Design an enzyme around this catalytic site. Structure first.
Site, PDB file in Angstrom:
ATOM      1  CD  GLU A  51      -2.624   1.217   2.628  1.00 53.49           C
ATOM      2  OE1 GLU A  51      -2.443   0.286   3.440  1.00 53.49           O
ATOM      3  OE2 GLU A  51      -3.458   2.128   2.812  1.00 53.49           O
ATOM      4  CE  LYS A 124      -6.972   1.046   3.870  1.00 52.81           C
ATOM      5  NZ  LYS A 124      -5.764   1.610   4.538  1.00 52.81           N
ATOM      6  CB  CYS A 175      -4.246  -1.737   5.107  1.00 56.88           C
ATOM      7  SG  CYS A 175      -3.801  -1.233   6.811  1.00 56.88           S
TER       8      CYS A 175
END
Length: 428
Positions: A51, A124, A175
């Site tokens: 990321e 995301k 994440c």
């Protein structure tokens, strides 16, 4: 119809610092060059970056990330992934700060085919606290799946060579996507991993900036200056002992290219979480990451759940996304007169469907984790430990569970690259 697939997966682990884009890109080419010079090197079919692999992560303000944001088909990260895909004839996925035409900011990861053109761009879905500093937008499409055309990777079980083509159903998670929604949602929801089970994802790709437990996350500590100053000194010493700068290791590359050294199955204890042994993976996070993919893991109690019908209301009650998510500004149960669609029979809760105790049983899925290493702001220690995993579906909530194969892992604090020949099967 069964279809054996052999995928050559390469994972790049970096330690990017804010303002060192050119230097990071230069180190990246240094890594890729060293990879091809390995004795057991083989051309990768897919390369995954962490990321924000080039720009760094801990941005404090919107104005700070603005010099590093790019469009999905423009900028350093795009050109890097493009040049890599053209030099290796592979798929390249890299995390990057995105800006669209409406001047909205995202935490995104672009995908580039061997022909050097982007075929997809995932944003995301679940946001971390740091994303709020620069007003990052949630993925309006929520969790997403996308096809990846792999040539000369598939074969029938009778054939002796992978000469057939295969379109794998892939999915990218970043994440926080693995974590419960805003760290407030129930742990048993398993949003992202359930999404992959529901939509029958075969290839899971996870660019990460995941943290080591020794990092500072206590909100009262961060906003208390004498508590924060005392907290920073605890981290500085842990890095000084390991003969590394406060920012972490850079330029020294750990390479595991082509080998078959598997990661030892270790349960989580009080020592596996400490920040020591840079060439070794953070097994506390490895076990946790595996736990977050519970629906892919074998659990004996699923039989008792299915026969007693304990999760039916949970399955039928389960929505696609959390109700307060950005997903439900556009899109939109019974027990009525409406028939049951196939999508309903594909839905799962805790890995359990309406027709099967464990839906994923008998299937294969590949998990690829690209997590960055190093340290930022003298408070955040990234866990690194990039690795490749395989869920076999064959019939412990950690690495001890043999329903998942630990095909290899990188160090928890060293830049480098790991390549693995991954073999599994799909159904067409």
């Amino acid at each position: 119809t069964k279809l054996l697939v052999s995928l050559k997966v390469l994972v790049i682990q970096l330690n990017p610092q804010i303002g060192q884009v050119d230097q990071t890109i230069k180190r990246t080419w240094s890594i890729l060059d060293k990879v091809t010079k390995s004795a057991t090197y083989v051309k990768p079919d897919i390369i995954l970056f962490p990321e924000f692999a080039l720009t760094g992560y801990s941005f404090h303000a919107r104005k700070d990330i603005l010099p590093y944001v790019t469009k999905k088909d423009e900028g350093p990260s795009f050109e890097l992934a493009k040049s890599i895909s053209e030099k290796f004839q592979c798929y390249t996925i890299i995390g990057y700060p995105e800006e669209d035409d409406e001047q909205k900011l995202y935490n995104s990861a672009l995908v580039v085919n061997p022909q050097g053109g982007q075929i997809f761009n995932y944003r995301k879905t679940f946001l971390y606290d740091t994303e709020m500093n620069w007003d990052c937008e949630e993925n309006p499409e929520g969790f997403q799946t996308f096809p990846m055309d792999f040539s000369k990777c598939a074969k029938l079980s009778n054939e002796d060579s992978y000469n057939r083509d295969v379109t794998l159903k892939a999915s990218i998670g970043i994440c926080m996507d693995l974590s419960p929604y805003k760290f407030m949602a129930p742990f048993n929801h398993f949003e992202f991993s359930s999404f992959c089970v529901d939509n029958n994802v075969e290839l899971i790709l996870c660019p990460m900036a995941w943290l080591n437990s020794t990092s500072i996350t206590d909100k009262q500590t961060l906003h208390n200056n004498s508590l924060l100053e005392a907290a920073k000194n605890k981290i500085a010493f842990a890095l000084k002992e390991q003969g590394l700068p406060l920012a972490g290791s850079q330029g020294i590359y750990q390479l595991k290219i082509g080998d078959s050294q598997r990661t030892p199955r270790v349960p989580s204890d009080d020592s596996t979480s400490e920040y020591k042994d840079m060439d070794e993976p953070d097994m506390s996070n490895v076990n946790y990451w595996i736990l977050r993919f519970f629906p892919f893991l074998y659990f004996k109690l699923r039989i008792n759940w299915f026969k007693n019908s304990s999760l039916i209301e949970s399955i039928l009650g389960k929505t696609r996304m959390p109700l307060d998510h950005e997903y439900y500004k556009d899109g939109k149960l019974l027990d009525s007169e409406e028939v049951i669609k196939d999508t309903v029979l594909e839905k799962t809760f805790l890995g359990t469907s309406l027709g099967q105790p464990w839906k994923f049983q008998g299937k294969n899925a590949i998990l690829v984790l690209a997590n960055r290493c190093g340290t930022e702001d003298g408070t955040t220690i990234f866990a690194g430990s990039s690795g490749i995993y395989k869920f076999n579906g064959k019939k412990s909530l950690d690495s001890l569970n043999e329903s998942v194969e630990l095909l290899g892992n990188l160090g928890k604090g060293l830049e480098g690259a790991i390549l693995r020949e991954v073999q599994f099967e799909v159904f067409r």
